[model samples]
Target chain A: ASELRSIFSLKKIADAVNGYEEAKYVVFGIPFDNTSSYRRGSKYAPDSIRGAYVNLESYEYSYGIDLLASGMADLGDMEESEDVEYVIDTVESVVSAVMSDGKIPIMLGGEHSITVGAVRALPKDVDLVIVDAHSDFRSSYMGNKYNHACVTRRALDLLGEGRITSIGIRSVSREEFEDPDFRKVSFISSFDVKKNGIDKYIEEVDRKSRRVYISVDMDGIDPAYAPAVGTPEPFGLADTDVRRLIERLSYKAVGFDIVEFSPLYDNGNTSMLAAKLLQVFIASREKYYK
Target chain B: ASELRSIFSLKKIADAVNGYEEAKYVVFGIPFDNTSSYRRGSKYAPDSIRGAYVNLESYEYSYGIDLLASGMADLGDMEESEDVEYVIDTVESVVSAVMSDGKIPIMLGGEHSITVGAVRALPKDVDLVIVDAHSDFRSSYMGNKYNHACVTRRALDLLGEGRITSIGIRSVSREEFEDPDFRKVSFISSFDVKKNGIDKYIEEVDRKSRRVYISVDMDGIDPAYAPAVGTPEPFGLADTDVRRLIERLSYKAVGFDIVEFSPLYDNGNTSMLAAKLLQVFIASREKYYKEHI
Candidate 1:
């Protein structure tokens, strides 16, 4: 039979970590793209990200690490279906298992909505921070309460007031902008962050608690940097700024997720960016979690 | 826009060859799979093969080459259509263009029938050699004259009588095996090759005119080695044997085509195997085509 290699050519972090008992960060992919309203190819993000990972140069000078060599295990992608509730249930169950076993769960997303399931598995008191291009505060978008647009609101349903914060916001509906629930949630617009810097937002996340679940919507970054996203918005975060944010956030992050990487629009660049960002997140894990 | 690398991280061989001028091999993908009868995922083979290409180690020891650095031009994939005729015409026109440029065309296939189009573009007198598990010698399969099964017959219509040879054939219909036309075509079964050795078959191909158009149905390899094929047959050629055959055939091959790689059945391994085979063909081209001819 023909020989094959694992995703990213990294150690099958699952086997390396030995069933999460020794894992520092356990990674898994939730490859569901059913509610990707604008574009719908994020279902390929996991394989694309893994493909891009091997092609990248592995050393990171600033962190003094070979990111792939670090203790990060990649559990293969979860079996996905068009059924949203089932997808969420599967993600929640998997995340719950990883968390219960004392490992940080890093999810490769099919869409932002899968976060609701991951959040479902988190401790009720865990803080939520999302870096995204939209407010995603709608209670229901297009008759689906579990759509990508309602992800943060659903998280709010689980976390309640003062716990969920969103950064890199550049798009929003008037209804979302005016809603009291949306108004109360902390939001840092990408424009404001560009002018004032990301320090204030990092401080806000740090203040809530060191234990935070960070979710990154690829569209949160400028299309120039991350062009392959389901709902691309202009004037988004710069790659350098996002890297800085991830590095700082990783200091206190208990778990992290990156979503909305659409491979249909990608020509390898966006997947490579996602892989690099993941390595940066892994490198930072040693700074605090280790 | 974000910066992107080429599929497989191979240098855009086309641009590099502009400087070499004498560079012989130019590769392009025929991303058409509309006629796939049983399974229909060969459409994604080009991209999947390119993706799998990047993860593989570059150096090939027996050939003593770094495949990525070798002069190979990836002309990208042809825009294909659901209409089978249109696919064939597009392949013929593009391949004819490549041949006119004095370059050897290496086609990554959408399906085996695409070979008919490629053969239509070859020199009328050039020999034909096919490595496949199925004879694909049906006069017409499922009422379609141009179905993948009739690829060899169509090629025969183009390059008739004693000019075509097929190796690794293990599956055939009684009608195909018994046809009067099939009798004229030379065939070497997989079992005979296992018993005698590939060198005898290699010698048979060598006896044919040196200028040959080679078609490889990936199903020619055992399902144990290449499971992601459209119509898989058991007890096929080993990976090593195919590589050796390609290396030996490279001495006289004017062009080559590998087809029927179904991406749906693939777990990345089949695409990787296809990519490696293409590299071996290119590596062999430099070994002998440059030296022998």
Candidate 2:
């Protein structure tokens, strides 16, 4: 009974690939942006990303892959709630349902905080890979434990120690860098990703457990290339590097989410990039099947 | 004591070309966007444009010119006022000073309403060229004469009819299209600009007058290309055509302004395009000087 959900009335190719009964991936949006520490307006990301997708070619030129050939369903955006706990619970409930149905959840975020709820819904012992500019390792920030600043910390508690791999850490707080739990986790600085290349890092992730859940915070990409992120950092991975990482991770990623695309700050470029990245993730997964 | 002004600390090469006394073109911004009819964030345009300018190259590849070599001064942005009359008066006073001192004023808008104040500061009989999606010919909008919806009508009252030419107009109200004064004004629709091309329109402007003041509303370009305007229309001129039109205008333009770049709606493309368009205007003016003088 899964039907293609239209955004801005544009038919998504993701929904055309298969029915909900046959699809392995289900895409939905959590249109919440209230926990944003810096600039607001990521709440508009779902529709903006959808608007940008209509402008893209169905056949991705780089991968020589047609994403429509993949088996995925678009569930459209969740009706958002303003209360923090309600938002988290809603995301948790949906992700849990998607997992229970044996379909991988592809959640698009309003901000990074949605990742905590998403990770909470996963079955125990699933390895986590987070591509982000900040460590998000604060025990509590702005007097709240569930703030976006503490997303990964919450995820680490859910999945236990040494179960998460963090990449693109360029703007971490002193507390995040000095934490004992963070030391045990695998951390890749954006500077190293830029200099040494991310191949070895991807290899490292490949060496770890195969049941991985990937979370991408768009700020992990450099502000020069992805200027529409919520809190853009100066030095970060290029679009090419981010794509390569995502492509490699598709081999093991059980579920994925891309978050923090602020449409207000973008001139269609950043949104287009997000759309292309989403397409790449789908195309890469289909490539695995082929 | 005017040291070279930098836009948000990224040095504008244009500022280094000449001192304020020696400069032929002086640029300043009115960082106001409260009169916005829709999408209220062009107030962030000045800083956003400055930030986007940092990512651009000094050399314009299309024009084969370095914009920094031109004799221009960046006056930074005016300290804005919330009072509409005070804002208009402040712009008028500063523009009057710049004109009296024999320097061309380049004003950046917080929205289109600032143009009414800018045109008021002009001396006499100067022809105006407005590149916009809307006719902006409302005699009175929301009962305010200075509203952005009525900028051109106010400008026309000051400069008189038949002295203005509007290009890239694709949206119009029945009140605007039916006005006798609007009927007298020359307009080039966006369709013609896309189909027959903009060269003939520029030629028409060339044949009409030598004293010209240009105002550009970023929404004049298509929403696909310049999506960060306060009121974006669907069908509009391409960026290439706009650049060509501006380049042609540089031959006779005495002063110019670019406006309605809403930073909140921009992912950096509209502001970058605005920065580049400003560069092109400066480059083309310098090209004119080389060709004539």
The global C-alpha lDDT for each of the candidates, from Candidate 1 onward, is: 0.77, 0.78
lDDT of 1 by residue, A1-290 (tens): 00101101221222223334445777777778998768988987877776576555656777876654666666656655798888888778777766777777888887998999888987766788888999998989888999889998888888778888888999998888888788668888999999999887787777777478889998999999999988889998998888888898787776888999788786789988888888888887664544
Top model number, TM-score? 1
Error of 2 at A125 (Å): 52
Q: Evaluate every candidate with DockQ and list the scores.
A: 0.03, 0.04
- Pairs with backbone N, CA or C atoms under 3 Å apart (clashes), candidate 2: A265-B267, A266-B266, A266-B267, A267-B267
Can you tell me the DockQ of model 2? Answer: 0.04
Which is the leading candidate under DockQ? 2
Q: lDDT of candidate 1 vs native? A: 0.77
Residue lDDT tens for model 2, A16-88? 4576787777887888987775567888887787778877877877677776666777877777777667888
| Interface C-alpha RMSD per candidate, 1 decimal | 16.5, 12.3
RMSD of 1: 17.5
